[PDB]
Amino acid sequence: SGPLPDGWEQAMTQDGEIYYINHKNKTTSWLDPRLDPRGGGGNRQPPPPYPLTA
């Protein structure tokens, strides 16, 4: 399959915090597509804005 649905993809930070990247909004998110079984979240400080290129 390669990339995600189309326009975004899954990646990891320098601390392996597993993050998602949306090539459409040039921003990253925690949204979990087909990789994140059960899990009762509760609070996740907003993700950092990933800039596409300097």
Short mmCIF file of all heavy atoms in Angstrom, two decimals:
data_model
loop_
_atom_site.label_atom_id
_atom_site.label_comp_id
_atom_site.label_asym_id
_atom_site.label_seq_id
_atom_site.Cartn_x
_atom_site.Cartn_y
_atom_site.Cartn_z
N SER A 1 0.86 -1.22 0.00
CA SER A 1 0.00 0.00 0.00
C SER A 1 0.88 1.25 0.00
O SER A 1 0.65 2.18 -0.74
CB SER A 1 -0.88 0.00 1.25
OG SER A 1 -1.39 -1.31 1.47
N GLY A 2 1.89 1.28 0.83
CA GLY A 2 2.79 2.47 0.87
C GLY A 2 2.18 3.52 1.81
O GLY A 2 1.75 3.21 2.90
N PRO A 3 2.16 4.75 1.38
CA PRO A 3 1.60 5.87 2.19
C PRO A 3 0.21 5.54 2.76
O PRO A 3 -0.32 4.48 2.53
CB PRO A 3 1.51 7.03 1.19
CG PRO A 3 2.53 6.74 0.15
CD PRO A 3 2.66 5.21 0.08
N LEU A 4 -0.37 6.44 3.50
CA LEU A 4 -1.71 6.18 4.08
C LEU A 4 -2.77 6.52 3.01
O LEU A 4 -2.43 6.90 1.91
CB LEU A 4 -1.86 7.05 5.33
CG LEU A 4 -1.12 6.40 6.49
CD1 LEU A 4 -1.13 7.33 7.70
CD2 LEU A 4 -1.80 5.08 6.87
N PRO A 5 -4.05 6.38 3.31
CA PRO A 5 -5.13 6.67 2.36
C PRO A 5 -4.70 7.56 1.19
O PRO A 5 -4.92 7.23 0.04
CB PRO A 5 -6.15 7.37 3.26
CG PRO A 5 -5.98 6.72 4.61
CD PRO A 5 -4.64 5.95 4.58
N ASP A 6 -4.09 8.67 1.47
CA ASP A 6 -3.64 9.57 0.38
C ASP A 6 -3.59 11.01 0.89
O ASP A 6 -4.60 11.62 1.15
CB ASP A 6 -4.61 9.48 -0.80
CG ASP A 6 -4.62 10.80 -1.57
OD1 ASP A 6 -3.61 11.49 -1.53
OD2 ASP A 6 -5.63 11.10 -2.18
N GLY A 7 -2.41 11.55 1.03
CA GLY A 7 -2.29 12.94 1.52
C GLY A 7 -1.71 12.93 2.93
O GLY A 7 -1.44 13.97 3.51
N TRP A 8 -1.51 11.77 3.50
CA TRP A 8 -0.95 11.72 4.88
C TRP A 8 -0.20 10.41 5.10
O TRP A 8 -0.16 9.56 4.24
CB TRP A 8 -2.08 11.88 5.89
CG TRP A 8 -2.86 10.62 6.06
CD1 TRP A 8 -3.52 9.95 5.08
CD2 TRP A 8 -3.11 9.89 7.29
NE1 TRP A 8 -4.15 8.86 5.65
CE2 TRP A 8 -3.93 8.78 7.01
CE3 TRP A 8 -2.70 10.09 8.62
CZ2 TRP A 8 -4.33 7.89 8.01
CZ3 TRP A 8 -3.10 9.21 9.62
CH2 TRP A 8 -3.91 8.11 9.32
N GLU A 9 0.42 10.25 6.25
CA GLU A 9 1.18 9.00 6.50
C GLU A 9 1.53 8.89 7.99
O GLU A 9 1.40 9.82 8.74
CB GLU A 9 2.47 9.02 5.68
CG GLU A 9 2.39 7.97 4.57
CD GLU A 9 3.78 7.75 3.98
OE1 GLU A 9 4.59 7.11 4.63
OE2 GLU A 9 4.02 8.23 2.88
N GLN A 10 1.99 7.74 8.40
CA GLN A 10 2.37 7.55 9.83
C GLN A 10 3.89 7.67 9.97
O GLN A 10 4.63 7.24 9.11
CB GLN A 10 1.92 6.17 10.30
CG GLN A 10 2.30 5.98 11.77
CD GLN A 10 1.59 4.74 12.33
OE1 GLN A 10 1.68 3.67 11.76
NE2 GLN A 10 0.89 4.84 13.42
N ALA A 11 4.36 8.26 11.03
CA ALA A 11 5.83 8.40 11.21
C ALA A 11 6.17 8.42 12.70
O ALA A 11 5.33 8.17 13.54
CB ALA A 11 6.30 9.71 10.56
N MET A 12 7.40 8.73 13.03
CA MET A 12 7.80 8.77 14.46
C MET A 12 8.67 10.00 14.71
O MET A 12 9.32 10.50 13.82
CB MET A 12 8.59 7.50 14.81
CG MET A 12 9.61 7.23 13.71
SD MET A 12 8.95 6.00 12.55
CE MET A 12 9.32 4.53 13.54
N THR A 13 8.68 10.50 15.92
CA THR A 13 9.50 11.69 16.23
C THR A 13 10.90 11.24 16.64
O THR A 13 11.31 10.13 16.36
CB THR A 13 8.84 12.46 17.38
OG1 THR A 13 8.30 11.54 18.31
CG2 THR A 13 7.72 13.35 16.83
N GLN A 14 11.64 12.09 17.30
CA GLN A 14 13.01 11.69 17.73
C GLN A 14 12.91 10.89 19.02
O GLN A 14 13.86 10.29 19.47
CB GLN A 14 13.86 12.94 17.97
CG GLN A 14 15.33 12.63 17.66
CD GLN A 14 15.57 12.73 16.16
OE1 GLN A 14 16.66 13.06 15.73
NE2 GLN A 14 14.60 12.47 15.33
N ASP A 15 11.75 10.88 19.62
CA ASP A 15 11.56 10.12 20.88
C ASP A 15 10.61 8.96 20.62
O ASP A 15 10.06 8.36 21.52
CB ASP A 15 10.98 11.04 21.95
CG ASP A 15 10.83 10.27 23.26
OD1 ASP A 15 11.43 9.21 23.38
OD2 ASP A 15 10.13 10.75 24.13
N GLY A 16 10.42 8.63 19.37
CA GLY A 16 9.52 7.51 19.02
C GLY A 16 8.13 7.74 19.63
O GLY A 16 7.57 6.87 20.26
N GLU A 17 7.58 8.91 19.45
CA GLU A 17 6.23 9.19 20.01
C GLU A 17 5.18 8.85 18.97
O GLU A 17 4.03 9.25 19.07
CB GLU A 17 6.13 10.66 20.38
CG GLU A 17 7.40 11.08 21.13
CD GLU A 17 7.21 12.49 21.71
OE1 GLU A 17 7.39 13.44 20.97
OE2 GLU A 17 6.89 12.58 22.88
N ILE A 18 5.57 8.12 17.99
CA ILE A 18 4.63 7.73 16.90
C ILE A 18 3.67 8.88 16.60
O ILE A 18 2.79 9.19 17.37
CB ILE A 18 3.84 6.49 17.32
CG1 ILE A 18 2.73 6.22 16.30
CG2 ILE A 18 3.22 6.71 18.70
CD1 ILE A 18 3.34 5.88 14.95
N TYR A 19 3.83 9.51 15.47
CA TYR A 19 2.93 10.64 15.11
C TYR A 19 2.45 10.47 13.67
O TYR A 19 3.02 9.72 12.90
CB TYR A 19 3.69 11.96 15.26
CG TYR A 19 4.62 12.16 14.09
CD1 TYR A 19 4.11 12.48 12.82
CD2 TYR A 19 6.00 12.02 14.26
CE1 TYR A 19 4.98 12.66 11.74
CE2 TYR A 19 6.87 12.21 13.18
CZ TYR A 19 6.36 12.53 11.92
OH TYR A 19 7.22 12.71 10.85
N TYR A 20 1.41 11.16 13.30
CA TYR A 20 0.89 11.05 11.91
C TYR A 20 1.14 12.36 11.18
O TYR A 20 1.21 13.41 11.77
CB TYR A 20 -0.61 10.75 11.94
CG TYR A 20 -0.81 9.36 12.48
CD1 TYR A 20 -1.02 9.16 13.84
CD2 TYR A 20 -0.78 8.26 11.61
CE1 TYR A 20 -1.20 7.87 14.35
CE2 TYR A 20 -0.96 6.97 12.11
CZ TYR A 20 -1.17 6.77 13.48
OH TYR A 20 -1.35 5.49 13.97
N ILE A 21 1.31 12.30 9.89
CA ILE A 21 1.59 13.53 9.12
C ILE A 21 0.58 13.70 7.98
O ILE A 21 0.37 12.80 7.18
CB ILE A 21 3.02 13.43 8.59
CG1 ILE A 21 3.07 13.80 7.11
CG2 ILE A 21 3.53 12.00 8.75
CD1 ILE A 21 2.60 15.24 6.93
N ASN A 22 -0.04 14.85 7.90
CA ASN A 22 -1.04 15.09 6.82
C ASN A 22 -0.41 15.97 5.73
O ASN A 22 -0.24 17.16 5.90
CB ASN A 22 -2.26 15.81 7.41
CG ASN A 22 -3.52 15.33 6.69
OD1 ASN A 22 -4.17 16.10 6.00
ND2 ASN A 22 -3.92 14.10 6.84
N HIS A 23 -0.07 15.38 4.61
CA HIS A 23 0.55 16.17 3.51
C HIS A 23 -0.47 17.18 2.97
O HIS A 23 -0.14 18.04 2.17
CB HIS A 23 0.98 15.23 2.39
CG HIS A 23 2.04 14.30 2.90
ND1 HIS A 23 3.26 14.75 3.40
CD2 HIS A 23 2.09 12.93 3.01
CE1 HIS A 23 3.97 13.68 3.77
NE2 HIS A 23 3.30 12.54 3.56
N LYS A 24 -1.69 17.10 3.40
CA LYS A 24 -2.72 18.06 2.91
C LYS A 24 -2.68 19.32 3.77
O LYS A 24 -2.64 20.43 3.26
CB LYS A 24 -4.11 17.41 3.02
CG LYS A 24 -4.31 16.44 1.86
CD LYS A 24 -4.70 17.21 0.60
CE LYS A 24 -6.19 17.01 0.31
NZ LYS A 24 -6.43 15.58 -0.07
N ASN A 25 -2.69 19.17 5.06
CA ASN A 25 -2.65 20.36 5.95
C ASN A 25 -1.21 20.58 6.42
O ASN A 25 -0.96 21.28 7.39
CB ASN A 25 -3.55 20.12 7.16
CG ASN A 25 -5.02 20.14 6.72
OD1 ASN A 25 -5.31 19.98 5.55
ND2 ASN A 25 -5.95 20.34 7.60
N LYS A 26 -0.26 19.99 5.75
CA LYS A 26 1.16 20.16 6.16
C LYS A 26 1.26 20.11 7.68
O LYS A 26 2.06 20.80 8.29
CB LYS A 26 1.69 21.50 5.65
CG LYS A 26 0.91 22.65 6.31
CD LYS A 26 1.61 23.98 6.02
CE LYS A 26 2.13 24.57 7.33
NZ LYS A 26 2.94 25.79 7.04
N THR A 27 0.45 19.31 8.31
CA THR A 27 0.49 19.21 9.80
C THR A 27 0.48 17.74 10.22
O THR A 27 0.09 16.87 9.47
CB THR A 27 -0.73 19.92 10.38
OG1 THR A 27 -1.61 20.30 9.33
CG2 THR A 27 -0.28 21.17 11.14
N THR A 28 0.91 17.46 11.42
CA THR A 28 0.92 16.05 11.89
C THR A 28 -0.16 15.86 12.95
O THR A 28 -0.62 16.80 13.57
CB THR A 28 2.29 15.72 12.48
OG1 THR A 28 2.86 16.90 13.03
CG2 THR A 28 3.20 15.17 11.39
N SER A 29 -0.59 14.64 13.17
CA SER A 29 -1.65 14.41 14.19
C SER A 29 -1.45 13.05 14.86
O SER A 29 -0.59 12.28 14.48
CB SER A 29 -3.02 14.44 13.51
OG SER A 29 -2.94 15.22 12.32
N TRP A 30 -2.24 12.74 15.85
CA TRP A 30 -2.10 11.43 16.54
C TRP A 30 -3.11 10.44 15.96
O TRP A 30 -3.04 9.25 16.20
CB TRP A 30 -2.36 11.60 18.04
CG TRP A 30 -1.46 12.65 18.59
CD1 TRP A 30 -1.87 13.79 19.20
CD2 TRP A 30 0.00 12.68 18.61
NE1 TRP A 30 -0.76 14.52 19.59
CE2 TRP A 30 0.42 13.88 19.25
CE3 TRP A 30 0.99 11.80 18.15
CZ2 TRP A 30 1.77 14.19 19.42
CZ3 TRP A 30 2.35 12.11 18.32
CH2 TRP A 30 2.74 13.30 18.95
N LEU A 31 -4.07 10.92 15.21
CA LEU A 31 -5.09 10.02 14.62
C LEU A 31 -4.45 8.67 14.28
O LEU A 31 -3.43 8.60 13.63
CB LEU A 31 -5.66 10.65 13.35
CG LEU A 31 -6.91 9.89 12.91
CD1 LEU A 31 -8.13 10.46 13.63
CD2 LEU A 31 -7.10 10.04 11.40
N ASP A 32 -5.06 7.59 14.70
CA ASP A 32 -4.50 6.25 14.40
C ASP A 32 -5.40 5.53 13.39
O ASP A 32 -6.55 5.25 13.67
CB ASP A 32 -4.42 5.42 15.69
CG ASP A 32 -4.11 6.35 16.87
OD1 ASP A 32 -4.95 7.16 17.20
OD2 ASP A 32 -3.02 6.23 17.41
N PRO A 33 -4.89 5.25 12.22
CA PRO A 33 -5.67 4.57 11.15
C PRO A 33 -5.81 3.06 11.41
O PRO A 33 -6.69 2.63 12.13
CB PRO A 33 -4.85 4.82 9.88
CG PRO A 33 -3.45 5.09 10.33
CD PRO A 33 -3.52 5.56 11.79
N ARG A 34 -4.97 2.26 10.82
CA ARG A 34 -5.07 0.80 11.03
C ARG A 34 -3.92 0.33 11.92
O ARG A 34 -3.39 -0.75 11.75
CB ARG A 34 -4.99 0.08 9.68
CG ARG A 34 -3.90 0.73 8.81
CD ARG A 34 -4.55 1.40 7.60
NE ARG A 34 -5.80 2.09 8.02
CZ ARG A 34 -6.37 2.95 7.22
NH1 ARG A 34 -5.83 3.22 6.06
NH2 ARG A 34 -7.47 3.55 7.58
N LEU A 35 -3.52 1.14 12.86
CA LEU A 35 -2.41 0.74 13.76
C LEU A 35 -2.65 1.32 15.16
O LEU A 35 -2.09 2.34 15.52
CB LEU A 35 -1.09 1.28 13.20
CG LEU A 35 0.06 0.90 14.14
CD1 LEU A 35 1.08 0.05 13.39
CD2 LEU A 35 0.73 2.18 14.66
N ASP A 36 -3.47 0.69 15.94
CA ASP A 36 -3.75 1.21 17.31
C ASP A 36 -4.93 0.44 17.92
O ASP A 36 -6.03 0.95 18.01
CB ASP A 36 -4.09 2.70 17.23
CG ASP A 36 -4.92 3.09 18.45
OD1 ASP A 36 -4.70 2.52 19.51
OD2 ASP A 36 -5.76 3.97 18.31
N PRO A 37 -4.69 -0.77 18.33
CA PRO A 37 -5.74 -1.64 18.95
C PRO A 37 -6.48 -0.92 20.08
O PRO A 37 -6.58 0.29 20.11
CB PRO A 37 -4.96 -2.83 19.49
CG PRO A 37 -3.70 -2.89 18.69
CD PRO A 37 -3.39 -1.46 18.25
N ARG A 38 -7.00 -1.66 21.02
CA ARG A 38 -7.74 -1.03 22.15
C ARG A 38 -6.86 0.05 22.79
O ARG A 38 -5.72 0.23 22.42
CB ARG A 38 -8.08 -2.09 23.19
CG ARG A 38 -9.29 -2.91 22.72
CD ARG A 38 -10.49 -2.62 23.61
NE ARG A 38 -10.79 -1.16 23.58
CZ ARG A 38 -12.02 -0.74 23.75
NH1 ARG A 38 -12.98 -1.61 23.95
NH2 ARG A 38 -12.29 0.53 23.72
N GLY A 39 -7.38 0.76 23.75
CA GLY A 39 -6.58 1.82 24.42
C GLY A 39 -7.50 2.94 24.91
O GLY A 39 -8.09 3.66 24.13
N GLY A 40 -7.64 3.08 26.20
CA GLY A 40 -8.53 4.14 26.74
C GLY A 40 -7.73 5.43 26.92
O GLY A 40 -7.18 5.70 27.97
N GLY A 41 -7.66 6.24 25.90
CA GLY A 41 -6.90 7.52 26.01
C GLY A 41 -7.52 8.40 27.10
O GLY A 41 -8.12 7.91 28.04
N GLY A 42 -7.38 9.69 26.98
CA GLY A 42 -7.97 10.60 28.01
C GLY A 42 -7.49 12.03 27.75
O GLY A 42 -8.26 12.97 27.81
N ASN A 43 -6.23 12.20 27.47
CA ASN A 43 -5.71 13.57 27.21
C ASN A 43 -4.38 13.48 26.46
O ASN A 43 -3.49 12.74 26.84
CB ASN A 43 -5.48 14.30 28.54
CG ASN A 43 -6.63 13.97 29.50
OD1 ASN A 43 -6.53 13.06 30.30
ND2 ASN A 43 -7.73 14.67 29.45
N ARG A 44 -4.23 14.22 25.40
CA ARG A 44 -2.96 14.17 24.62
C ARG A 44 -2.58 15.58 24.19
O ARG A 44 -3.05 16.09 23.19
CB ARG A 44 -3.16 13.30 23.37
CG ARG A 44 -2.12 12.17 23.35
CD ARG A 44 -2.74 10.90 23.95
NE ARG A 44 -1.65 9.97 24.37
CZ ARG A 44 -1.35 9.84 25.63
NH1 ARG A 44 -2.00 10.54 26.53
NH2 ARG A 44 -0.40 9.03 26.00
N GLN A 45 -1.71 16.23 24.93
CA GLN A 45 -1.30 17.61 24.56
C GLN A 45 -1.23 17.71 23.03
O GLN A 45 -0.64 16.88 22.37
CB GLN A 45 0.08 17.91 25.15
CG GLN A 45 0.12 17.45 26.61
CD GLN A 45 0.78 16.07 26.70
OE1 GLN A 45 1.51 15.68 25.82
NE2 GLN A 45 0.55 15.32 27.74
N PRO A 46 -1.82 18.74 22.47
CA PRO A 46 -1.83 18.95 21.00
C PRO A 46 -0.47 18.65 20.36
O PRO A 46 0.57 18.98 20.91
CB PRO A 46 -2.17 20.44 20.86
CG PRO A 46 -2.98 20.77 22.08
CD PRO A 46 -2.55 19.80 23.19
N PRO A 47 -0.48 18.03 19.22
CA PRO A 47 0.77 17.67 18.48
C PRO A 47 1.47 18.90 17.88
O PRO A 47 0.83 19.88 17.55
CB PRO A 47 0.29 16.74 17.37
CG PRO A 47 -1.15 17.08 17.16
CD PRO A 47 -1.68 17.60 18.49
N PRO A 48 2.76 18.83 17.74
CA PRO A 48 3.57 19.95 17.17
C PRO A 48 3.39 20.05 15.65
O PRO A 48 3.29 19.06 14.96
CB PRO A 48 5.01 19.56 17.51
CG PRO A 48 5.00 18.08 17.65
CD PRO A 48 3.60 17.69 18.13
N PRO A 49 3.35 21.25 15.14
CA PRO A 49 3.18 21.50 13.68
C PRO A 49 4.42 21.08 12.87
O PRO A 49 5.48 21.64 13.01
CB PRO A 49 2.97 23.01 13.57
CG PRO A 49 3.57 23.58 14.82
CD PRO A 49 3.47 22.51 15.90
N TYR A 50 4.28 20.09 12.04
CA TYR A 50 5.44 19.63 11.22
C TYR A 50 5.50 20.45 9.93
O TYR A 50 4.63 20.35 9.09
CB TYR A 50 5.27 18.14 10.90
CG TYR A 50 5.09 17.95 9.41
CD1 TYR A 50 6.20 17.72 8.59
CD2 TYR A 50 3.81 18.02 8.85
CE1 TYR A 50 6.04 17.56 7.21
CE2 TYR A 50 3.64 17.85 7.47
CZ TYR A 50 4.76 17.62 6.65
OH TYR A 50 4.59 17.46 5.29
N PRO A 51 6.52 21.25 9.77
CA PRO A 51 6.69 22.10 8.56
C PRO A 51 7.23 21.32 7.37
O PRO A 51 8.19 20.58 7.48
CB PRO A 51 7.70 23.16 9.01
CG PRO A 51 8.51 22.50 10.09
CD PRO A 51 7.61 21.44 10.73
N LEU A 52 6.63 21.48 6.22
CA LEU A 52 7.12 20.75 5.02
C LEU A 52 8.29 21.50 4.40
O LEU A 52 8.11 22.39 3.59
CB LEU A 52 5.98 20.64 3.99
CG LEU A 52 6.03 19.27 3.31
CD1 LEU A 52 4.76 19.07 2.48
CD2 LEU A 52 7.25 19.20 2.40
N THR A 53 9.50 21.16 4.77
CA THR A 53 10.68 21.86 4.20
C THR A 53 10.94 23.15 4.99
O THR A 53 10.04 23.72 5.58
CB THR A 53 10.41 22.21 2.73
OG1 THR A 53 9.49 21.27 2.19
CG2 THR A 53 11.72 22.16 1.95
N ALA A 54 12.16 23.61 5.01
CA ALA A 54 12.47 24.86 5.76
C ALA A 54 11.37 25.88 5.52
O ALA A 54 10.47 25.96 6.35
CB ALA A 54 13.81 25.42 5.27
#
